[PDB]
Design a protein around this ligand. Structure first.
Ligand SMILES: O=C(O)[C@H](CC1CC1)Nc1ncnc2[nH]ccc12
Length: 164
């Protein structure tokens, strides 16, 4: 049910869209969240996804952290997708604004390989501070499963496609 995506490689597709609106439209099996190790969904994609679940994603995440402790940078956990998807794969990319190692971005994308198809944002882009052109390159060179990338910013989408 994904539509209006531009094909980049055999398995990677991209579209200028709000991932929350895309998730409500498609109801994918897996939506990826650009999480931090604490699953504190304050801003960016995480804040937007959480707000669409009426804060149910934050309640569930806090119970997960209380039981298991924080995730590793480069790591992930599968939780409920609530009203947006069957599951939400919370993936932690490196936040270069917090001094985290950019080499962990490839480890972050490797988490996508455990799922046949995913709706996702560019990891470590936005307020995580990494170069989005670099993040898209790591994605197509690491992910082997079917990934549908939603890029919110129009000007960034245009730059990604024209420079790919
Ligand atoms: O549009 C995106 O998908 C990303 C992540 C954002 C949606 C959470 N935005 C950006 N990423 C990197 N640099 C940027 N400069 C201006 C916008 C921008």
């Amino acid at each position: 049910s994904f539509s209006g995506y531009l094909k980049l490689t055999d398995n990677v597709y991209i579209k200028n869209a709000d991932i929350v609106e895309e998730a409500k439209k498609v109801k994918p099996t897996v939506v990826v969240n650009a999480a931090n190790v604490y699953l504190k969904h304050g801003g960016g994609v995480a804040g937007a996804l959480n707000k669409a679940t009426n804060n149910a994603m934050q309640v569930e995440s806090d119970d997960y952290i209380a039981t298991n402790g924080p995730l590793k940078v480069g790591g992930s956990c599968v939780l409920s997708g609530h009203n947006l998807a069957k599951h939400c794969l919370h993936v932690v990319g490196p936040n270069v604004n917090k001094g985290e190692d950019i080499q962990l971005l490839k480890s972050a994308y490797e988490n996508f390989n455990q799922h046949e198809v995913l709706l996702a944002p560019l990891l470590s882009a936005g307020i995580f501070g990494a170069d989005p052109i670099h993040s898209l390159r790591v994605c197509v060179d690491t992910v082997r499963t079917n990934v549908y990338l939603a890029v919110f910013d129009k000007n960034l989408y245009d730059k990604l496609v024209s420079s790919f």
